Design a binder for this molecule. Structure first.
Ligand SMILES: [Ca+2]
Ligand SMILES: [Ca+2]
Ligand SMILES: [Ca+2]
Ligand SMILES: [Ca+2]
Ligand SMILES: [Ca+2]
Ligand SMILES: [Ca+2]
Ligand SMILES: [Ca+2]
Ligand SMILES: [Ca+2]
Ligand SMILES: [Ca+2]
Ligand SMILES: [Ca+2]
Ligand SMILES: [Cl-]
Ligand SMILES: [Cl-]
Ligand SMILES: [Cl-]
Ligand SMILES: [Cl-]
Ligand SMILES: [Cl-]
Ligand SMILES: [Cl-]
Ligand SMILES: [Cl-]
Ligand SMILES: [Cl-]
Ligand SMILES: [Cl-]
Ligand SMILES: [Cl-]
Lengths: 187, 197
C-alpha cells in the first residue's frame, strides 16, 4: 500500500536535495513515487505570496495543506505510491509556533481538520545550526535558532516518527541512512 | 476608541446597500468611517483563490480565515484605534453560517480557529438582514463561488444566521429584509443613535 514520508529542516539543511535523492532511488528501484512539497502542493497560488501577519500566513498555508492532503497526498497513497513531501505540518509548527511564537495548541487545532489526521510514517529531520544553514542558503539568527530547537522538541515528543540526522554529514552518508530506514518499510 | 459594526445576510438581502448607506449617513454627521468587507478586505487575492475548482470546504474556510486575520490586524484594529466607525459587510458570522451550517464544517472547530484569527474581536452590533432564501435567490444571482448549490444550502445558511442571532441577542439586530429599504435604514440608524452619540 502507500507510504507517506516527509522531509524537514531549515532551508539549507539539505532537506530538498535529500527529498530528490530519495525519489530518484525509488524510481531506480521501480517503486512508484510522488515527490511533492509545501507550500504550494495544494494551492500553487499561495506559494507565490506577501507581507502577512503570521496568523494569516499559517491559515493560508493550512488552506494549501488541506487541498494538498485531499487532492494530492491521499490519492497518491490510495494508488500505493511512496508520497514524499518536502515540508509538511512540522514546518508550520516549528516556524510559526516555536519561531514566531504562535500558540501551539491553536496551530494544532487548525491542523486536525486541515490534515484530516494524516501523519507521515517517517519524517527525516535534517538537523543543523542556523549558522551552517545560512552559509548554504542565505528575521535573523535567534529566530532560526528557535526554529531549529522547535524541530528538535517535536522530534523528542514523537521519537518513533522522527528520524534526526546530522545534516553536516556528507550527502551520501545521509542518503544511505535514509535508505536504510526505508528498506524495511518497502514490500 | 472606535466602533466596530457588521452587516450580515444572504446576497440580495440588502446588507451591502445598507452598509453603504450607513457609512454615508455617518460621514454626513462628520464621523470618521471605514467601510470594508469580507471576503477580500484583508487579502484581496483570496477572492481569486476562492474560485479554485472543487475546493474542499475546509480550505475555503481557511482561506476566509486568512483573509479575516489580516483584515483584523491591518485594517479593522488600526481603524478602531484611530477612532473610526469600522463597518464590515460580512465578518465571522458569514463563515459560521455558510461554512458551518451551510457546508457542514464542525462549529466548535470553526470557533477554535476563529478565536486567534480574529484576535477575539467581535462587533459591537451586527445587523442581520433576514429573509427567506427563495426570496433572496430571486433578487440577485449567487456569487460565482457559490454557483451550483441548491436552495437547501441557502436554507441552512439562513437558518444558521438566525441560530447565531438567538445565541447572541445583545449583539445581533435582526431586521426583516422584506421591509422597504428606507425603513431598514431608519431602523439601523435608530439602533445606532445612542452609540453615536
Ligand atoms: Ca534543521
Ligand atoms: Ca537542499
Ligand atoms: Ca535521501
Ligand atoms: Ca513533517
Ligand atoms: Ca495546518
Ligand atoms: Ca448568498
Ligand atoms: Ca445589497
Ligand atoms: Ca443603513
Ligand atoms: Ca474573510
Ligand atoms: Ca458579523
Ligand atoms: Cl503511511
Ligand atoms: Cl533545504
Ligand atoms: Cl504530523
Ligand atoms: Cl512517535
Ligand atoms: Cl446584499
Ligand atoms: Cl440612509
Ligand atoms: Cl476566522
Ligand atoms: Cl463575532
Ligand atoms: Cl425578494
Ligand atoms: Cl449577546
Amino acid at each position: 500500500p502507500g507510504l507517506f514520508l516527509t522531509l524537514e529542516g531549515l532551508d539549507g539543511s539539505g532537506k530538498t536535495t535529500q527529498a530528490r535523492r530519495l525519489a530518484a532511488f525509488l524510481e531506480a528501484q521501480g517503486r512508484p513515487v510522488l515527490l511533492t512539497r509545501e507550500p504550494g502542493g495544494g494551492l500553487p497560488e499561495v506559494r507565490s505570496l506577501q507581507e502577512l501577519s503570521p496568523e494569516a500566513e499559517y491559515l493560508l498555508f493550512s488552506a494549501d495543506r488541506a487541498e494538498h492532503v485531499r487532492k494530492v497526498i491521499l490519492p497518491g497513497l490510495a494508488a500505493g505510491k511512496v508520497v514524499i513531501s518536502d515540508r509538511y505540518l512540522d514546518s508550520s509548527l516549528a516556524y510559526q509556533g516555536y519561531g514566531r511564537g504562535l500558540p501551539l495548541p491553536w496551530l494544532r487545532e487548525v491542523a486536525r481538520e486541515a490534515t484530516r489526521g494524516l501523519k507521515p510514517r517517517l519524517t527525516f529531520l535534517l538537523d543543523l545550526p542556523p549558522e551552517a544553514a545560512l552559509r548554504r542558503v542565505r528575521l535573523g539568527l535567534e529566530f532560526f535558532r528557535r526554529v531549529r530547537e522547535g524541530y528538535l522538541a517535536l522530534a523528542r515528543a514523537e521519537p518513533g516518527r522522527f528520524v534526526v540526522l546530522d545534516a553536516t554529514l556528507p550527502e551520501e552518508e545521509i542518503a544511505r541512512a535514509i535508505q536504510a530506514h526505508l528498506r524495511p518499510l518497502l514490500p
